[PDB]
Amino acid sequence: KLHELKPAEGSRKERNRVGRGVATGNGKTSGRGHKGQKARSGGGVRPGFEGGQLPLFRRLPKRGFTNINRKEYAIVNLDQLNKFEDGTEVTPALLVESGVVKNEKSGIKILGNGSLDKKLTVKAHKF
Amino acid sequence: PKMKTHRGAAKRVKRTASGQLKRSRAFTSHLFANKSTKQKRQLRKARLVSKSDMKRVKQLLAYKK
Amino acid sequence: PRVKGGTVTRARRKKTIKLAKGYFGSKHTLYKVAKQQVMKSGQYAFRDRRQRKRDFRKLWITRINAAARQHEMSYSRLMNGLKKAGIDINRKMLSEIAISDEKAFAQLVTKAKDAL
Amino acid sequence: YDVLKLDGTKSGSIELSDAVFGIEPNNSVLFEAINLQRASLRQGTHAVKNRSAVSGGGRKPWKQKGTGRARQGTIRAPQWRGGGIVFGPTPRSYAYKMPKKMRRLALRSALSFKAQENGLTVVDAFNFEAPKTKEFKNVLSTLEQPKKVLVVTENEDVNVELSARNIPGVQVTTAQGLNVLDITNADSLVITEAAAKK
RNA sequence: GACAAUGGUAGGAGAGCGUUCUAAGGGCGUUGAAGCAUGAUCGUAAGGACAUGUGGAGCGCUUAGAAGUGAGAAUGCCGGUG
RNA sequence: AGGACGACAUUAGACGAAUCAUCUGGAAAGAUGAAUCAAAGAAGGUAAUAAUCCUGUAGUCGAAAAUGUUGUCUCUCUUGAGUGGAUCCUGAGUACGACGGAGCACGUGAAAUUCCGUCGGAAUCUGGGAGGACCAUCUCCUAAGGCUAAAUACUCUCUAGUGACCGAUAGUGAACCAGUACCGUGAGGGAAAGGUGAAAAGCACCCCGGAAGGGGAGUGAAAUAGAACCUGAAACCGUGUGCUUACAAGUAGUCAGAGCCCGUUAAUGGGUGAUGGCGUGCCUUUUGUAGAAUGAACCGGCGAGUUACGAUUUGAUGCAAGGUUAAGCAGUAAAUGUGGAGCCGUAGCGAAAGCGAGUCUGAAUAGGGCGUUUAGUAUUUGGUCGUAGACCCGAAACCAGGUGAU
Ligand SMILES: [Mg+2]
Ligand SMILES: [Mg+2]
Ligand SMILES: [Mg+2]
Ligand SMILES: [Mg+2]
Ligand SMILES: [Mg+2]
Ligand SMILES: [Mg+2]
Ligand SMILES: [Mg+2]
Ligand SMILES: [Mg+2]
Ligand SMILES: [Mg+2]
Ligand SMILES: [Mg+2]
Ligand SMILES: [Mg+2]
Ligand SMILES: [Mg+2]
Ligand SMILES: [Mg+2]
Ligand SMILES: [Mg+2]
Ligand SMILES: [Mg+2]
Ligand SMILES: [Mg+2]
Ligand SMILES: [Mg+2]
Ligand SMILES: [Mg+2]
Ligand SMILES: [Mg+2]
Ligand SMILES: [Mn+2]
Ligand SMILES: [Mn+2]
Ligand SMILES: [Mn+2]
Ligand SMILES: [Mn+2]
Ligand SMILES: [Mn+2]
Ligand SMILES: [Mn+2]
Ligand SMILES: [Mn+2]
Ligand SMILES: [Mn+2]
Ligand SMILES: [Mn+2]
Ligand SMILES: [Mn+2]
Ligand SMILES: [Mn+2]
Ligand SMILES: [Mn+2]
Ligand SMILES: [Mn+2]
Ligand SMILES: [Mn+2]
Ligand SMILES: [Mn+2]
Ligand SMILES: [Mn+2]
Ligand SMILES: [Mn+2]
Ligand SMILES: [Mn+2]
Ligand SMILES: [Mn+2]
Ligand SMILES: [Mn+2]
Ligand SMILES: [Mn+2]
Ligand SMILES: [Mn+2]
Ligand SMILES: [Mn+2]
Ligand SMILES: [Mn+2]
Ligand SMILES: [Mn+2]
Ligand SMILES: [Mn+2]
Ligand SMILES: [Mn+2]
Ligand SMILES: [Mn+2]
Ligand SMILES: [Mn+2]
Ligand SMILES: [Mn+2]
Ligand SMILES: [Mn+2]
Ligand SMILES: [Mn+2]
Ligand SMILES: [Mn+2]
Ligand SMILES: [Mn+2]
Ligand SMILES: [Mn+2]
Ligand SMILES: [Mn+2]
Ligand SMILES: [Mn+2]
Ligand SMILES: [Mn+2]
Ligand SMILES: [Mn+2]
Ligand SMILES: [Mn+2]
Ligand SMILES: [Mn+2]
Ligand SMILES: [Mn+2]
Ligand SMILES: [Mn+2]
Ligand SMILES: [Mn+2]
Ligand SMILES: [Mn+2]
Ligand SMILES: [Mn+2]
Ligand SMILES: [Mn+2]
Ligand SMILES: [Mn+2]
Ligand SMILES: [Mn+2]
Ligand SMILES: [Mn+2]
Ligand SMILES: [Mn+2]
């Protein structure tokens, strides 16, 4: 079948060749249909922004992991070779509730609404 | 080359939402006592970049969130 | 890969020039000039194909006017009687009968002369 | 399962292998890898002349007005004879990449077509130099053939018309297995594929 | 099978024709390839064949890939000739 | 800090496998009928397209000398380690400050860190610097002396090769005796121009002519390939002539149409055209152009939306609460194997501390903003934007180096 190939229907379309005959042979008609036609994207001829600015950014920001932890029937944690967190800077455990199993949670900074349920089935807190 | 971010807008945008740019609002600097206390208290609460302008400013904050 | 100009041009242009075949002078020999003439030539024929339909109906009408006139009847009157006669022949037929058969045309005349 | 014909013979010593080797059909991926292969196999050595900065030149051929000729800039501007070439080819990469799992989806769907048509498995044997392989290839087989094995130099069949791709079942490529209309496999070679393919 | 719609500049959308190169398949070719010339040929268009003369090596078809892919106008460039 | 022994390499080269017949033909490699080799079916050449005809290829040997190159002897050069501390020593017109600059991604700024000019100008293991002004504290270091390979950049040149790069207006400016004819005082600018044939067999000889050139005769497959030589389009120039034309006002055609002449890709044919109807080229630009607005003498060739990298969106495909690699190694300038740093997603809200399916404002568990209820991600065709000259051609000008008072 190497001589009768076919691409998946829907991929691939013949690119548009402007300016090659009279099934359209152009672009616009005057003004900035000049080559490298300007207007900055933004620069709409009077401010555009120029209207307030509010700023900072500082340091420490955690990395969330919600109580969708239908892991094993117990065991410790932070072990995320398991398919859960990755690219963590800390590890808070939040809610969206379903503490459907009992285990011992361990990460830094647990959310109060979460930990109320984690400790209401097996007890669990740490740093 | 990577597109540069218009950092002057980014100092006044805040993205978040479901793609909408947040706010910042005008006449909020100085020269009070000519705006109404009604105008004053209301320009305090913030409003998004408009549909028509996000059509124009879409490229500059492409890297915000 | 570079594509050369290649044959495609000449073969295209010769197409046109062969269309300009009966034409005068360099309207039959230069592409640039013969292109314009062949364009117009069909631009005429397109309208002329419609016009000939009316150029011909007018021919029969006058011919009918002629043989109606010979029976002391205007073409105006003949068609009014033929309508009320319920005859539904059409000019090109009506006129051709007037040339090929004097008697047959006279009969339809008298048919249309009553029913008036 | 599939018979294992004796080299040169008929010792149809069956044994099992399939699923990620048979069973699988797919095509839409199978094409897209074939293109990724031949994309990558080309150097883009082409480069056209003047980005008008190429070619000696660049005084203004005559003053603007007063001449009655058209205004001109370089005598190498692209509409001249011997001028620059707007947007010629330039050398470039001509070669993308496709996600890992899909690369594997290719080869299975490649080999599975050979299973759905026909493709032989074999004992092995070896020695030195091969007009003999024609007799070995005439066991039955057909016009275009490849062979696989973890080892190498059993391929002094480089020089056969057609039929002269032979690579380890780890150097296996979507070209052949598509190009070639039959394929012949040492066991263990076919095992080494079955190991990796899963 | 009825029944509807089908003027059109900027401009959007769609489907295609042809050119060169690549791949695989399948071919043609000194019993004459490309090219050139001629014809009253075929297709809705771009365009495709066939026959003959010329010519004396090459070239097509299918499927897909890629493009220096299509000219009538730029007081466009170069050549030739009015 | 310089020189004596023998392995490899560079600079000449050698061996190197296997075909015959026929048909066509000027010639066989083509077709066909039987063969053979192959660690060699890469490539080019040979009277047409050749694995087996030649140069070669895979492969195998080969160096007098000359460098280059190393293993190793010699050759130098060699003194190598720890405990405690009184009192010495660890780079002064320096670090540092002010002033004027300059530099750090960082424009004097809150301006650390680093360098110049100019006046000032310290300390001495109870020392000095640094940690983004500064002090304290803490931690890391130890400036004001020097040298140091590899991984990195480049290609005038050499050898060996590669290309979905050009194929004579292309490709170098230059396939040819190109930086040459040619132009300028000069710096400097800078062309055009390839192809007989397989083989020179390049036309002995007769003929008209002073010759040029030509008709024969000849070589050749072909000179209707004869040198300004393959093919040999078009404009343009001519010879012949079938139909037509000297009372007619014409963007030249179109529609109708007798007459005459011919006979095809054989089809409700071809050429011409008395005469009748209709009828102000094209392009551009325009409210509007037959326009007396613009452009083109004609014919040919050349001649303008590209690519890279980012963005966004659509479509296709793979996986999916996940998706996915970058460099780098491996590989045959692949594919691929590797590599999970990294990026995006699973959570949002707030300027922020921060709290979290909710948060922000707020005194409020009022209200109100953004969010919650569920899908992404990687590659890629297309569209579009951004960065690039960014569709093409076009200034008057500006700056920098030079060249000119013949
Ligand atoms: Mg945020
Ligand atoms: Mg606003
Ligand atoms: Mg200049
Ligand atoms: Mg080999
Ligand atoms: Mg012959
Ligand atoms: Mg012969
Ligand atoms: Mg043969
Ligand atoms: Mg040859
Ligand atoms: Mg100083
Ligand atoms: Mg070389
Ligand atoms: Mg003589
Ligand atoms: Mg020739
Ligand atoms: Mg001619
Ligand atoms: Mg005007
Ligand atoms: Mg005009
Ligand atoms: Mg799903
Ligand atoms: Mg709320
Ligand atoms: Mg709400
Ligand atoms: Mg100057
Ligand atoms: Mn299209
Ligand atoms: Mn224009
Ligand atoms: Mn415009
Ligand atoms: Mn434009
Ligand atoms: Mn420009
Ligand atoms: Mn910024
Ligand atoms: Mn702003
Ligand atoms: Mn204020
Ligand atoms: Mn007011
Ligand atoms: Mn080419
Ligand atoms: Mn052209
Ligand atoms: Mn230049
Ligand atoms: Mn002029
Ligand atoms: Mn050039
Ligand atoms: Mn329409
Ligand atoms: Mn209509
Ligand atoms: Mn349009
Ligand atoms: Mn479009
Ligand atoms: Mn053919
Ligand atoms: Mn060709
Ligand atoms: Mn072009
Ligand atoms: Mn000219
Ligand atoms: Mn030899
Ligand atoms: Mn030999
Ligand atoms: Mn022979
Ligand atoms: Mn060799
Ligand atoms: Mn020191
Ligand atoms: Mn300091
Ligand atoms: Mn200071
Ligand atoms: Mn200062
Ligand atoms: Mn600090
Ligand atoms: Mn190199
Ligand atoms: Mn040529
Ligand atoms: Mn001179
Ligand atoms: Mn020659
Ligand atoms: Mn003579
Ligand atoms: Mn002869
Ligand atoms: Mn000539
Ligand atoms: Mn010639
Ligand atoms: Mn008169
Ligand atoms: Mn007359
Ligand atoms: Mn008049
Ligand atoms: Mn007329
Ligand atoms: Mn008229
Ligand atoms: Mn045009
Ligand atoms: Mn006029
Ligand atoms: Mn004008
Ligand atoms: Mn003019
Ligand atoms: Mn022209
Ligand atoms: Mn836009
Ligand atoms: Mn663009």
From Swiss-Prot, chain A:
Q: Where is this region: Disordered?
A: 1-53
Where composition is biased (Gly residues), the residues are 41-51
Question: Can you name a GO cellular component term?
Answer: cytosolic large ribosomal subunit
Entry keywords, A to Z = Ribonucleoprotein, Ribosomal protein, RNA-binding, rRNA-binding
Q: Quote the biased-composition stretches of kind Basic and acidic residues, using this chain's numbering.
A: 1-17
Which GO molecular-function terms appear in the entry? rRNA binding; structural constituent of ribosome
InterPro entries, alphabetically?
Ribosomal_uL15, Ribosomal_uL15/eL18, Ribosomal_uL15/eL18_sf, Ribosomal_uL15_bac-type, Ribosomal_uL15_CS
Keyword Cytoplasm attached: no
- Which Gene3D superfamilies does the entry mention? 3.100.10.10
One Pfam entry for this protein is Ribosomal_L27A
Any single biological process term in GO: translation
UniProt function note:
Binds to the 23S rRNA.
Q: Which family does it belong to?
A: Belongs to the universal ribosomal protein uL15 family.
What is its quaternary makeup? Part of the 50S ribosomal subunit.
What's the protein name? Large ribosomal subunit protein uL15
The species is Staphylococcus aureus (strain NCTC 8325 / PS 47)
Swiss-Prot record, chain B:
Listed PROSITE patterns: RIBOSOMAL_L35 (PS00936)
Keywords carried by this UniProt record = Ribonucleoprotein, Ribosomal protein
Bilayer-crossing residues are none
- From which domain of life does this come? Bacteria
Pfam families, alphabetically? Answer: Ribosomal_L35p (PF01632)
Spell out the InterPro entries in the cross-references. Ribosomal_bL35, Ribosomal_bL35-like, Ribosomal_bL35_CS, Ribosomal_bL35_sf
Enumerate the residue ranges of region (Disordered).
1-48
Task: Give residue spans, biased composition: Basic residues.
Answer: 1-15, 37-48
Q: Which GO terms describe its cellular component?
A: cytosolic large ribosomal subunit
GO molecular-function annotation terms? structural constituent of ribosome
Give the record's GO biological process terms.
Answer: translation
- Record bears the keyword Transport: no
Instruction: Report the sequence similarity comment from the record.
Output: Belongs to the bacterial ribosomal protein bL35 family.
* HAMAP family registered for this protein in UniProt: Ribosomal_bL35 (MF_00514)
Would you tell me the protein name for this molecule? Large ribosomal subunit protein bL35
Which source organism?
Staphylococcus aureus (strain Mu3 / ATCC 700698)
Q: Which gene encodes it?
A: rpmI
UniProtKB/Swiss-Prot annotation, chain C:
MF terms in GO: rRNA binding; structural constituent of ribosome
Q: Which CDD domains match?
A: Ribosomal_L20
Which Pfam families does the protein's record reference? Ribosomal_L20
Query: Can you tell which superkingdom this protein's organism belongs to?
Result: Bacteria
Keyword terms = Ribonucleoprotein, Ribosomal protein, RNA-binding, rRNA-binding
Q: Please provide the Gene Ontology terms (biological process) for this protein.
A: ribosomal large subunit assembly; translation
SUPFAM superfamilies assigned: Ribosomal protein L20 (SSF74731)
List, alphabetically, the InterPro entries matched: Ribosomal_bL20, RIBOSOMAL_L20_CS, Ribosomal_protein_bL20_C
Per the record, its GO cellular-component terms are: ribonucleoprotein complex; ribosome
Question: Its family?
Answer: Belongs to the bacterial ribosomal protein bL20 family.
Role: Binds directly to 23S ribosomal RNA and is necessary for the in vitro assembly process of the 50S ribosomal subunit. It is not involved in the protein synthesizing functions of that subunit.
What is the name of this protein?
A: Large ribosomal subunit protein bL20
Q: Which organism is it from?
A: Staphylococcus aureus (strain Mu3 / ATCC 700698)
Curated annotation (Swiss-Prot), chain D:
- Record keywords, A-Z: Ribonucleoprotein, Ribosomal protein, RNA-binding, rRNA-binding
- One GO MF term attached to the UniProt entry: rRNA binding
List, alphabetically, the Gene3D superfamilies matched.
Answer: 3.40.1370.10
Segments for region (Disordered): 47-73
Query: For this UniProt entry, which residues form the secretion signal?
Result: none
Q: Name one Pfam family in it.
A: Ribosomal_L4
Q: What does this protein do?
A: One of the primary rRNA binding proteins, this protein initially binds near the 5'-end of the 23S rRNA. It is important during the early stages of 50S assembly. It makes multiple contacts with different domains of the 23S rRNA in the assembled 50S subunit and ribosome.
Q: Which NCBIfam families match?
A: rplD_bact
HAMAP family per UniProt: Ribosomal_uL4_B (MF_01328_B)
This one is known as Large ribosomal subunit protein uL4
